[PDB]
């Protein structure tokens, strides 16, 4: 009566109390092993004997694990609990073709970081205002698709249709997509836009040549240190004016999941039930509260999201606003054709900024993109 759990690196101690509570309530023992979330899929394929009963993963890999038969639909009991307690965006993270396969525990989104000695709060709600009054820095020469890929969805185009599950639904090859490429190209002559490399985002923020930039919670500490805690502002993504339309700038949402792999239980339904119970425990309000407090995990649970501790933390509050609605975030699609998206979107965004494609080529390149990705 032992089940194996894979938890994110560093996290084991954070979860000790949660696990003890589960152990005391279920009478199962839990073997807890740290293991990198992004590698869970590879690890399972390589050695299914050693595979954990319960493991953390990023939702962007959930579609693959479903399609290989590794993760099965959760029991209806848990489906109801997850839908009730999670944000709608988090649930979309946990679902694939209409079924729930995992338990959200966390969310992540990029935000706008700015220097309060260079920009007032009032002036960071609009990209046009930011670059009129100060500077915005981005890595446009070597485009980051995670960062600026969502511009295409910001203007009302989709990545694999509205639900992110139609392999033929990506529709950038139109005037709105072309207008995204135009805006990219225009940033080269926008006097408030500063062309960055990955390795100088933070240092140019520190030296004051970049007043603002977009990144995730992983850069929060470095931003703080670059200009001083008291000078660091955090805000939601601004509006941006593309093709003469002012629209909300979107980012991707990442949803952090626990899932159950039934295979190591070999038909033992008592143990499978225990595995779902563990996942439920790991991702309930109490655990998410503890995970925010100990490891600054931004909760997927609506109730913890609105807690004073979380709402008083400007980074967490901002990530939550971004994850609160599809007005701000696109939940990263799960289809394997995302592979093409990463490669081709980066190249086209780069080429538009660098002038390796011209305006008269924007539409044909985007139409070709739409064809390529639909394979």
Residue numbers in the entry: 39 to 413
From the primary publication:
The crystal structure of SPs0871 in the absence of a ligand was determined at 2.20 Å. Three aromatic residues critical for ligand binding (Y184, W256, and W380) lined one side of the binding pocket, similar to the structure of other maltodextrin-binding proteins. The 6 of 16 residues in MalE1 that were identified in previous studies as being involved in ligand interactions are conserved in SPs0871. We first performed virtual screening for the two-state conformation of SPs0871. Using both conformations allowed us to assess whether potential ligands induce conformational changes in SPs0871 upon binding. Therefore, it is likely that 95,186 favorably binds to the unbound form. When we performed additional docking calculations using the Glide docking program (Schrodinger, New York, NY, USA) to identify hotspot residues for the compound binding, E146 and K294 were predicted to form hydrogen bonds and W256 was predicted to form van der Waals interactions during compound binding.
Among the virulence factors in GAS that can be targeted, proteins involved in complex carbohydrate catabolism have been implicated in pathogen infectivity.
